[PDB]
Amino acid sequence: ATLICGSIAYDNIMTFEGRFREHILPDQVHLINLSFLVPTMRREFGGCAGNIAYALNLLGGDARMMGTLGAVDAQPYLDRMDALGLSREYVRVLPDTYSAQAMITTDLDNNQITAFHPGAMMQSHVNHAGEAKDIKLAIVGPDGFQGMVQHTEELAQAGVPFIFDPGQGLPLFDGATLRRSIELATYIAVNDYEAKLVCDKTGWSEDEIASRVQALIITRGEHGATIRHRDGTEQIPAVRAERVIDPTGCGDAFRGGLLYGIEHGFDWATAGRLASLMGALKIAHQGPQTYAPTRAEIDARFETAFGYRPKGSKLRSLE
Amino acid sequence: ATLICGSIAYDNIMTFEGRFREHILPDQVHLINLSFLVPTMRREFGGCAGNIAYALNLLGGDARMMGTLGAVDAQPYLDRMDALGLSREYVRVLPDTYSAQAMITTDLDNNQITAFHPGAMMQSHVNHAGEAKDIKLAIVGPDGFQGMVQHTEELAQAGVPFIFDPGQGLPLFDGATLRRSIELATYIAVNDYEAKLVCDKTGWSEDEIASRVQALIITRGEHGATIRHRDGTEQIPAVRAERVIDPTGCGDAFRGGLLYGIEHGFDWATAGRLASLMGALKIAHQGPQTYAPTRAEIDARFETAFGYRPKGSKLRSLE
Numbered sequence: 001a002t003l004i005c006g007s008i009a010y011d012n013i014m015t016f017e018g019r020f021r022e023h024i025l026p027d028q029v030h031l032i033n034l035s036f037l038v039p040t041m042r043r044e045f046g047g048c049a050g051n052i053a054y055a056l057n058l059l060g061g062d063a064r065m066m067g068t069l070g071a072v073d074a075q076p077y078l079d080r081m082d083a084l085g086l087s088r089e090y091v092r093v094l095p096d097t098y099s100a101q102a103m104i105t106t107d108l109d110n111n112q113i114t115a116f117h118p119g120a121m122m123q124s125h126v127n128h129a130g131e132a133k134d135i136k137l138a139i140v141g142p143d144g145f146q147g148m149v150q151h152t153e154e155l156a157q158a159g160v161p162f163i164f165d166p167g168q169g170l171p172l173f174d175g176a177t178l179r180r181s182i183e184l185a186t187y188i189a190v191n192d193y194e195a196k197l198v199c200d201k202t203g204w205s206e207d208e209i210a211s212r213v214q215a216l217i218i219t220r221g222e223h224g225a226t227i228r229h230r231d232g233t234e235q236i237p238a239v240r241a242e243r244v245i246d247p248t249g250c251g252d253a254f255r256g257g258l259l260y261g262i263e264h265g266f267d268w269a270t271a272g273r274l275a276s277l278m279g280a281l282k283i284a285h286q287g288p289q290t291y292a293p294t295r296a297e298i299d300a301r302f303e304t305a306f307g308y309r310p311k312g313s314k315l316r317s318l319e
Numbered sequence: 320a321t322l323i324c325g326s327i328a329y330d331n332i333m334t335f336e337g338r339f340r341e342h343i344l345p346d347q348v349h350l351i352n353l354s355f356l357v358p359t360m361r362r363e364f365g366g367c368a369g370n371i372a373y374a375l376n377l378l379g380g381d382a383r384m385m386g387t388l389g390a391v392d393a394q395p396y397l398d399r400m401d402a403l404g405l406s407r408e409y410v411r412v413l414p415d416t417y418s419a420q421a422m423i424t425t426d427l428d429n430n431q432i433t434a435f436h437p438g439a440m441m442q443s444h445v446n447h448a449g450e451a452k453d454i455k456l457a458i459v460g461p462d463g464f465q466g467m468v469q470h471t472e473e474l475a476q477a478g479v480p481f482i483f484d485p486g487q488g489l490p491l492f493d494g495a496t497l498r499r500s501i502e503l504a505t506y507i508a509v510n511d512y513e514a515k516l517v518c519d520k521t522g523w524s525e526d527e528i529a530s531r532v533q534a535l536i537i538t539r540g541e542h543g544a545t546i547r548h549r550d551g552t553e554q555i556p557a558v559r560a561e562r563v564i565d566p567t568g569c570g571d572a573f574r575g576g577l578l579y580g581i582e583h584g585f586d587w588a589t590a591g592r593l594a595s596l597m598g599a600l601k602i603a604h605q606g607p608q609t610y611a612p613t614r615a616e617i618d619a620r621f622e623t624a625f626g627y628r629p630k631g632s633k634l635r636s637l638e
């Protein structure tokens with residue numbers, strides 16, 4: 001199974017139907033003033049671990065979320081996990097605490113500015129990744145800082161390869177702590193903005209970062225993604241979205257596809273392309289977990305976009 | 320009395336303790352990803368008319384709000400208006416509708432990105448500014464579009480001089496409609512970003528705009544403001560804030576001071592400086608209407624900042 005470490009949260013998403021880029025005037029003292037009409041607020045199921053596990057589960061993988069929720073309002077999420085067949089073994093529900101809540105303001109370029117009220121996420125380190133059974137692969141996503149660092153150290157000690165996904169948690173890291181996490185990581189997955197921040201904080205170039213992981217994956221929104229590995233760099237195309245509704249959690253849907261590909265021995269071109277497709281399926285719906293394709297629908301859309309069906313290598317090499 | 324036309328709304332404000340400028344990377348496909356920790360959400364009394372009338376009332380002016388609220392949840396605001404002595408004569412409460420709600424995400428530079436659920440504001444044109452009695456001065460602030468345009472036409476027809484304050488409503492205007500509003504206006508008050516947008520949409524330069532009003536007032540945050548009038552341009556200093564907590568509604572506190580100054584025949588240097596002080600008093604507190612100085616406290620802080628007490632001209636000229 002695949003351990004998915006990160007936030008579990010309720011999201012309130014406000015989508016600007018436009019591009020903040022067109023509205024920023026750097027020469028002015030106020031560089032952006034923008035008001036846009038929204039409908040009634042609706043809470044969505046989110047959190048980085050929730051979203052990544054949701055995607056992995058859609059593909060038929062065995063996603064084991066490791067995160068904390070608050071007993072006061074955890075129930076709808078616990079019931080949703082049960083209804084989808086997601087194990088709650090490592091979902092700790094903390095007494096007399098509220099679950100993480102994100103107020104996400106975003107545009108169609110996925111420029112997210114989020115006011116985050118962390119609640120139970122603050123105690124994410126109560127879970128010990130090293131103790132989780134039957135894990136062959138993991139991801140460490142945005143979470144409480146102490147919990148993020150502990151998950152990287154425990155997984156490395158346990159010899160569980162992991163994708164490091166610092167995401168919205170990046171500001172919590174200093175250079176030494178970020179360098180250390182990358183040393184421990186087997187793969188890193190970031191978007192292009194997060195990648196620049198990682199280079200800046202570590203003081204390492206992308207070349208130096210790539211030298212310390214099996215793959216450096218950098219997503220670029222509607223431009224697709226790049227996967228740098230030992231023998232080359234894959235240029236992964238985007239899949240054309242049926243419609244562009246809400247990019248929140250595109251990266252998480254993508255990470256669900258990448259984890260599935262890695263577990264099943266996909267080559268990077270096909271793991272990347274499956275990931276890229278998950279992100280395009282997700283963007284056509286509002287909220288990070290509203291899209292709900294069957295595995296047969298995923299495979300058909302993959303073959304339409306790319307010309308072949310996605311699955312793991314059948315080469316029986318010596319390794 | 321002074322008619323204050325604009326939105327009346329409940330605000331939910333998320334303040335980033337920092338500057339979005341430092342986090343925008345224009346070279347990347349994602350130019351900003353930022354998550355910041357917030358405390359529990361608290362609803363505040365807002366809306367542009369609410370805030371401007373609140374400021375005018377603090378100074379001892381006679382503020383008459385003209386706006387629409389929704390009967391479903393208007394009550395706390397109606398009770399607040401009663402407790403502060405703000406007349407509700409032109410506050411229309413619409414049946415089976417909800418009041419405007421703003422989810423404002425902002426930084427310490429007052430870069431506001433707002434998700435606005437307008438509710439009853441959509442029907443602001445049910446009020447007729449031309450019908451309001453005993454009005455010597457008005458402001459037309461951000462509101463429902465139809466209501467904004469109607470208020471400018473009715474006030475002009477009634478010969479009531481007004482400050483045009485398009486603010487967050489600016490995107491609703493086209494060039495012809497914006498040019499027309501400026502022709503009708505006696506003064507315009509914008510921040511520096513809104514000013515650039517006004518020049519862009521009308522296709523007029525600041526010189527051309529100034530030729531069509533008695534004063535063009537442009538606010539510049541911590542840099543103070545400029546007031547361009549027939550005989551010159553005042554450089555209005557900022558007042559150093561006691562602390563910088565929340566800039567939301569600084570411009571509205573400033574407009575309350577300007578309206579007071581205009582009604583009482585302040586010179587532009589002193590009207591500007593009173594306005595500038597109102598904005599500095601407001602920024603030291605969270606929410607647009609939380610600051611509550613007495614008039615004696617306002618006068619003392621004015622004299623500390625500027626070296627004299629603020630009041631209207633005592634020159635009895637021929638006019």
Ligand SMILES: Nc1ncnc2c1ncn2[C@@H]1O[C@H](COP(=O)(O)OP(=O)(O)O)[C@@H](O)[C@H]1O
Pocket residue numbers: 109110190191192219220221222223224225237238239240241244247248249250251252254275276277278279280283349
């Ligand atoms: N507008 C779009 N059209 C199609 N696919 C998209 C679009 N935006 C994102 N995706 C898919 O989702 C992936 C991740 O999106 P991205 O915005 O880079 O991640 P994040 O959510 O981490 O910021 C992209 O690499 C792409 O494959």
Ligand SMILES: Nc1ncnc2c1ncn2[C@@H]1O[C@H](COP(=O)(O)OP(=O)(O)O)[C@@H](O)[C@H]1O
Pocket residue numbers: 030428429509510511538539540541542543544556557558559560563566567568569570571573594595596597598599602
């Ligand atoms: N950081 C600050 N320190 C002191 N005064 C401020 C500050 N920011 C705003 N003000 C006062 O409030 C006025 C209006 O603020 P501004 O940010 O320009 O308006 P708006 O709310 O319309 O964007 C300024 O001209 C200044 O006088």
Ligand SMILES: O=c1[nH]cnc2c1ncn2[C@@H]1O[C@H](CO)[C@@H](O)[C@H]1O
Pocket residue numbers: 007009010011045046047048051102114116142143168169248249251252288354355
């Ligand atoms: O600062 C944060 N820490 C952890 N999780 C977060 C943060 N900000 C937003 N999200 C979560 O990120 C998901 C999209 O990838 C959203 O579902 C939101 O819950």
Ligand SMILES: O=c1[nH]cnc2c1ncn2[C@@H]1O[C@H](CO)[C@@H](O)[C@H]1O
Pocket residue numbers: 035036326328329330364365366367370421433435461462487488567568570571607
């Ligand atoms: O698009 C809008 N139209 C009208 N009013 C608005 C809009 N966006 C925000 N506010 C109001 O602006 C005030 C700060 O000046 C806030 O109190 C908010 O209620």
Ligand code: NA
Pocket residue numbers: 182183184185186187212213214
């Ligand atoms: Na490594």
Ligand code: NA
Pocket residue numbers: 501502503504505506531532533
């Ligand atoms: Na005019």
